Symmetry: C6
Subunit: 226 residues, 6 copies
Amino acid sequence: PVRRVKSGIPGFDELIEGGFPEGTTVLLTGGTGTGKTTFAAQFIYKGAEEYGEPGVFVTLEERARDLRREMASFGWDFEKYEKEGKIAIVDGVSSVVGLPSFNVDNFLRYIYRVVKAINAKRLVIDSIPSIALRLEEERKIREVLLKLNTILLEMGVTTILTTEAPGKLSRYGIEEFIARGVIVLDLQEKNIELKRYVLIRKMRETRHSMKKYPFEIGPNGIVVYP
Amino acid sequence: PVRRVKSGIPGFDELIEGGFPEGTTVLLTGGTGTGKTTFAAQFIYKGAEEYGEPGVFVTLEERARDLRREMASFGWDFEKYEKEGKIAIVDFNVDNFLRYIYRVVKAINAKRLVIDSIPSIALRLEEERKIREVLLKLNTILLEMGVTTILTTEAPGKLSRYGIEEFIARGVIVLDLQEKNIELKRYVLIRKMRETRHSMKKYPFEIGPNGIVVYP
Amino acid sequence: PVRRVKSGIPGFDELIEGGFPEGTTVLLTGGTGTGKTTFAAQFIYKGAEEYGEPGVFVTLEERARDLRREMASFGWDFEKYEKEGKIAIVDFNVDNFLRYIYRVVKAINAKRLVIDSIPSIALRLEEERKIREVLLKLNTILLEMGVTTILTTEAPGKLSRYGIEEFIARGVIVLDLQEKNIELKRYVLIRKMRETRHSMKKYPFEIGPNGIVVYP
Amino acid sequence: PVRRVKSGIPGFDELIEGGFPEGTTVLLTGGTGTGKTTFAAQFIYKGAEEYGEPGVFVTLEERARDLRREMASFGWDFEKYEKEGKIAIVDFNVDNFLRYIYRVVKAINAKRLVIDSIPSIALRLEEERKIREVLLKLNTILLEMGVTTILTTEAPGKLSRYGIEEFIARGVIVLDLQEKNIELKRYVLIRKMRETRHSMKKYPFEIGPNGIVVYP
Amino acid sequence: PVRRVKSGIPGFDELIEGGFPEGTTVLLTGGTGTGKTTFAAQFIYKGAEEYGEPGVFVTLEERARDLRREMASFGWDFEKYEKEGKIAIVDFNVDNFLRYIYRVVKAINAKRLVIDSIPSIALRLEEERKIREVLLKLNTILLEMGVTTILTTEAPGKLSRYGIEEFIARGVIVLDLQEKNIELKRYVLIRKMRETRHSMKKYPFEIGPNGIVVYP
Amino acid sequence: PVRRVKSGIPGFDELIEGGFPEGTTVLLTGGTGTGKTTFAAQFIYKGAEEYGEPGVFVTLEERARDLRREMASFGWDFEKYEKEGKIAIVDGVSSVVGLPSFNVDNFLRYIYRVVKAINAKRLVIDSIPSIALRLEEERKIREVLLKLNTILLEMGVTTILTTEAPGKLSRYGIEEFIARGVIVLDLQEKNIELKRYVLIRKMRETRHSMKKYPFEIGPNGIVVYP
Ligand SMILES: Nc1ncnc2c1ncn2[C@@H]1O[C@H](COP(=O)(O)OP(=O)(O)O)[C@@H](O)[C@H]1O
Ligand SMILES: Nc1ncnc2c1ncn2[C@@H]1O[C@H](COP(=O)(O)OP(=O)(O)O)[C@@H](O)[C@H]1O
Ligand SMILES: Nc1ncnc2c1ncn2[C@@H]1O[C@H](COP(=O)(O)OP(=O)(O)O)[C@@H](O)[C@H]1O
Ligand SMILES: Nc1ncnc2c1ncn2[C@@H]1O[C@H](COP(=O)(O)OP(=O)(O)O)[C@@H](O)[C@H]1O
Ligand SMILES: Nc1ncnc2c1ncn2[C@@H]1O[C@H](COP(=O)(O)OP(=O)(O)O)[C@@H](O)[C@H]1O
Ligand SMILES: Nc1ncnc2c1ncn2[C@@H]1O[C@H](COP(=O)(O)OP(=O)(O)O)[C@@H](O)[C@H]1O
Ligand SMILES: [Mg+2]
Ligand SMILES: [Mg+2]
Ligand SMILES: [Mg+2]
Ligand SMILES: [Mg+2]
Ligand SMILES: [Mg+2]
Ligand SMILES: [Mg+2]
């Protein structure tokens, strides 16, 4: 009887039999501006606020203060849950408060330390391209992804990793090999208007819907519709 | 008079005159989430449970505890058959990897073998394109062992990820997801199948509570 | 309340809840001749004339006299506002480039910045693909300056020339030329804008005697 | 009068004015599972049985026992004709490979030759792209032997895998699988044949219990 | 108040408000045989004959005697105007090539310049991709000289052969051949044109006994 | 008043105002088996037989004896004109008879010598890919093409060069830069049948037809139709 992590996104859990199987790494993929960051933030924020599960949002796309400001526009008070120790933001430039002190191995050690310090049940790495673009050699993302996979398996948290391609499921062709779930966010062209769609392409241990579902990014975040 | 190895997948054997010809290496290809790991698990697991044939499931995609756990969602108790010595799950050194599968296959007298997946091997090499040399080395031991094997590979067009996998298989099975009208629907096709007048049609299938079923 | 920077482009602000969130880096992308330089130049120029906001226009695609003469054809007198200290035109050493932009921005207390263009920077490097490392250095100084910036890039498919520009922007505007049936017509689309419920539709626009006008 | 070598494929000779001009090197190309090995094997086998003409089948895609067992499923008894000296099966050092083919061909006075396949040679090289230099060395020995040869290559677009194979052939046969509407159906087309006014149309064919049959 | 340089091509000036803005570098792009060399010749040759403006035609595509000979097929006597010192034809050392065009342009007080073609330069480099560095060097002297220049490039989609040429031009003219129904018909389009509200329509043209004519 | 070289191909000269301008290099391009070799051979053979102009056929695609045998199937007796000195075939393995003794510079010297020895007015190089595939480095075809161009200009003969692509006009993207004429041979798909078409894409000094023309390879070679 699989334990399920509620996504935090109204309309979504019903597509995946109540939520993500505990312990799954989910690849959230889509083009620029399809809602990846938002959807990942909602997962962590709602995890903490509605379901009381601590979460770590790792970002190399922006700084922590950018994410707090941006998510405030949905009414989400990240800093409130940070002071309560239910959320940490790892950007790192700024060390998480209370957890002081591109280098891949330090990075991964530090995410592991922070997951363990708050007893995180939820984790986001936004994004894989943000990591890759910071390496000496962008194609070593291959070796970095295999190191990440090893620490995800050890930590056993429920994780969203984001990646970005416009055919291709992912940017590098590798990201999907370390994920047991895949969610696509898209903007379809019809006919002078782009509407947002989500599709669950893959989800382990789950008889998930295989249909495209409309969605909106509203004043209170993502809502998925019939 | 070719001896046939039953797939374990309802609706599938009838497409290939009763089964896989014994000793064949079969390439199982399809995009992410098209049912490859499930198909290969079903072939090993029903081999043991229903046909009493020992089998080896080699996974570099995940670990044995993940595979056991995921497969119980379909009613399949992999550990029961591991302790009876009817299934082994094998969880980068290429030559040792190969030696070890060889030894486990002999050790349990396997008749079925799965390697899930070729990309998973290749992504662990120092240079990913050395999968070419690795595949030729793997072809050589498959030929020695003479078991019935499913290798999995994954491409989005192109039949395989590297354009090489198909040169060491004598059968190819494609799993797919099609567009219709705002739903994704699953299909299987036998592209090639030595010694067999197999169907060339596309068939719908479902992945349900008892795993894969192929329809008319 | 998010504080917004008015574009200077008639018909455009209502597409983005009144203007660009202050401090945003916006990528403006489009093929040759889709109107990127004019859009950028209008943002800086109307910022100075219409709203009093000082602005820096960095160009490696042309010299400062070229841009002055060219924008005069729209009735825009750049030199007037340069003399009043409300516009600076900045006309290969990457670190010195970046330091200089930061200086000029500070010196006039700039609220607006344009860099025209990312490709024009890349093409002057020892190795073109080092734009990746250059774009990362730009990002850190944009985040430090906290001004409102337009960066242009050019491709006609792909969003950007290099596949990297979009990762340092929190807004994306696409300018396009569509064929219908004998004639190319200009369209703008807002692909991304942080903190903004923007329109997602394609709008027609034209470049006329007073620069860009976006239509319903 | 051009002397022609009868294919052994029912329905095919009439497409090429009765057969292959003697001494021609013919490239047979097609995707995985389009029937290239069967076509080649039928050319050698029916050459021996039907016309008395001795033939060499070189394969790096499988072992000799594999091809014997596989072709038995068509009622073809390769070993009978091997024992009578009318068929040789030749089952990485390029020069030694080539020398050996030339020897076996001379030893049985072969009129027919197959090499299955060009990719299977390329994939065994130290560097795959050295097939260019290998194909040039093959060409010179085919021209010396003056037998009638089929070379296979595989791509599904491009005519050949490497873009080079076609330059050492004076005939080209394409085997294909076309979708209609639920089913893959097999077609053959003669793209090129020297000294021959061949048909230029696509013909259906099937692989049945007696091998290939081409239809109107 | 922008000064305009008449094209010399009937039907074309009216598409660009009377002519090219003085000092502009114009990229003229199109596939093989779309009329580029003819268009550029016509611009230099009518410049001299009809408008009394000196011009330089730089060709690395062919030699001066070929160009004179080909152009007389259109009634154009290039040598007459070479001896009056109103046209020069310039027939690998990059820096010397550049120095030399500079000197010939000064030497005859040229107002018009053609370089036919960018690919022709690039194909003569030690490394063809150094055309990037060469183009930036050429941009620097075009900016110094301030003449009105047509550069030609050739791509089959992509606007240019290298994706770089368009970053040193402030106008782009596309010449094309379209499919209709079993004939190829010629068209011209102005993609971009600084300082000009130019037509965005596609226009048919003919290359006749008097060279290029543009139609409605 | 341009001097014109009659192509030798019935139905063709009318497309190019009576023939090729004397001295032109023409790129003959098309996919495998579209008639390139045949069309080039007809030009040389008919040049010699019908119009009395000596011709050199250079081939690295096949040997001279292969070409004589192959062209005999059209009724063309190459060896007859070879003994009369009106045609030479350069393959080279075999030196042209009477002109004794991969190396690029030797190659080009030898074609120049043979053109000059028979006072050739016609030249064929079948094919550019055949040269390129024999080089140490296939991409040096670029440098080889510029050397070829220099000797073509010096010799002033009327030349066909053949190249082979299936979008792309040529195999390498370079061949068209040394040619002042381009002819495409194609096979169009309609509807289970491939029919042959020729199109003149470019021809210097000529108001050539711009239409696709059907053609056949018949028992007496190419014939082009209305
Ligand atoms: N508060 C808001 N209200 C409504 N929509 C918003 C709001 N903030 C941002 N958006 C929308 O969400 C988008 C940002 O999505 P984002 O999650 O950053 O995409 P990605 O990470 O895929 O590039 C904006 O481009 C905008 O369309
Ligand atoms: N227990 C379940 N019940 C129904 N469907 C399931 C169940 N578990 C997994 N699936 C389906 O099977 C898919 C997993 O298939 P999988 O064999 O891993 O594909 P692949 O290896 O090609 O990526 C999931 O995406 C889901 O759709
Ligand atoms: N003064 C003008 N009046 C009307 N249209 C103009 C004027 N100047 C330029 N244009 C039009 O605007 C275009 C300029 O586009 P530009 O901003 O330079 O595009 P980009 O930077 O994307 O290449 C010209 O191609 C022309 O079509
Ligand atoms: N005994 C048989 N009877 C009928 N069909 C067969 C038989 N054996 C093989 N086939 C069919 O012929 C195919 C063999 O094709 P093959 O010659 O090996 O193709 P290729 O070399 O191009 O990959 C099999 O995929 C199958 O469809
Ligand atoms: N004197 C002529 N009369 C009519 N058309 C001609 C004449 N000379 C050349 N042409 C046409 O012009 C074409 C040459 O155009 P050109 O300017 O060289 O194109 P490009 O440089 O783009 O390859 C020839 O292909 C032919 O169609
Ligand atoms: N004597 C013949 N009679 C009729 N057609 C022939 C004859 N000889 C060859 N052909 C046709 O001509 C073709 C050969 O064309 P070829 O000039 O070698 O093409 P390419 O050099 O473009 O590959 C053959 O493929 C065949 O269709
Ligand atoms: Mg994001
Ligand atoms: Mg799998
Ligand atoms: Mg611009
Ligand atoms: Mg085969
Ligand atoms: Mg030209
Ligand atoms: Mg040929």
